[PDB]
Amino acid sequence: MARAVGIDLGTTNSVVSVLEGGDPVVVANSEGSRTTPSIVAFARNGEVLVGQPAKNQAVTNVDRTVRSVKRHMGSDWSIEIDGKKYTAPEISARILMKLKRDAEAYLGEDITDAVITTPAYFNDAQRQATKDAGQIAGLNVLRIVNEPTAAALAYGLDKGEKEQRILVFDLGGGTFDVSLLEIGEGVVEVRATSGDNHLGGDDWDQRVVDWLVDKFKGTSGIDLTKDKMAMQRLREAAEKAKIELSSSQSTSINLPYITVDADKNPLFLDEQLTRAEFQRITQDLLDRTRKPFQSVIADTGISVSEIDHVVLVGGSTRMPAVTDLVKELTGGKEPNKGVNPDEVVAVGAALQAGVLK
Amino acid sequence: VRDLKEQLEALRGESERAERDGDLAKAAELRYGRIPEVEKKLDAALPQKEEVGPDDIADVVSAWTGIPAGRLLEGETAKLLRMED
């Protein structure tokens, strides 16, 4: 293999791809899901879950669960987790130690080097934070590849030698980045960047869950805010409805017994969703993506026709709401496909690794 | 019914673990189903002699001083009901 890897450490989708002789193999975590959810749940033990284990404790260790410390990398974003305050490098280093031993398990030895990514809206303070986390977790970022750059790598978007224009829409479950990329000579510039560092497809899921309990109380009048496990369940079902309606027009969701009803009957959940209503629901979350892209456009001053590739990264760009507003704003320009958007930036960062190896 | 109470305890462990696993579906199924239903069942299962009550006092004050102050304990009532016979 490449003696290193690449890591789309998403804001909610921490993914790591290796190179089976150059073949981008996104490694199944020891959690099974190749995507580690980029969440670090400092369980009330001193122990620290990561991934869907941590995600499950986003409601339970809500007071001790960290999400989107990605955004807070460049500081001492130092969370008082039982003992002392653990800065963003160490919260990242925890997920990195997980991924480290997942890959060591997948291997038979600890081939540990990496190319771990940053949004193009990040700054070199966040990247110094990642340098420290690498001193911590024991994996090497021999170089960082910003996430749009590793996107254009991952789809092999080596268009024109003189210069190529790669549009990149990152929507991780917890991050949004519009990026426009002038690339050449094997050397990359993300020419422009905008986005919504608060928006993600789990913000999309959060709007979903809003609606869920909205019509829950529309009929009967109970709030799953009142129930923490119900919030966990809504959140999980909502993201899996995300990856569902990244292919499905509509997904009906249902749950047995939850809380007492008005007549003291253990109430449940049962109804269709239509993805039309979904893109209606993320509509201002879709406005949270457009004028970002207008800003990156003005930053580059480029016609969407002149763009030589478009890219969808971050698993919430499996969504066709993403691709809809793409082909709307991009003049119909189809982003390149071949890797899962969560897998994309990890894959292409791994390609950079192999380019080093 | 002692096993079912312990079973009720087993149901409480079940709701604990349903909430551990994020099993909302079982959370209420145990909170508003199994546990309370077994509880009504166990309330029905209660036969009546493990603590003194407002009748042992009457029993003692009847054995002492000889004055009968009780509750017509199911044998005295039938007899008192046919006295003019």
From Swiss-Prot, chain B:
Q: Which organism is it from?
A: Mycobacterium tuberculosis (strain CDC 1551 / Oshkosh)
The gene from which this protein is expressed is: clpB
> What name appears for this protein in its UniProt entry?
Chaperone protein ClpB
Protein localization = Cytoplasm
Role according to the record: Part of a stress-induced multi-chaperone system, it is involved in the recovery of the cell from heat-induced damage, in cooperation with DnaK, DnaJ and GrpE. Acts before DnaK, in the processing of protein aggregates. Protein binding stimulates the ATPase activity; ATP hydrolysis unfolds the denatured protein aggregates, which probably helps expose new hydrophobic binding sites on the surface of ClpB-bound aggregates, contributing to the solubilization and refolding of denatured protein aggregates by DnaK.
Concerning its family, UniProt says: Belongs to the ClpA/ClpB family.
Domain notes from UniProt: The Clp repeat (R) domain probably functions as a substrate-discriminating domain, recruiting aggregated proteins to the ClpB hexamer and/or stabilizing bound proteins. The NBD2 domain is responsible for oligomerization, whereas the NBD1 domain stabilizes the hexamer probably in an ATP-dependent manner. The movement of the coiled-coil domain is essential for ClpB ability to rescue proteins from an aggregated state, probably by pulling apart large aggregated proteins, which are bound between the coiled-coils motifs of adjacent ClpB subunits in the functional hexamer.
What is annotated about its quaternary structure and interactions? Homohexamer. The oligomerization is ATP-dependent.
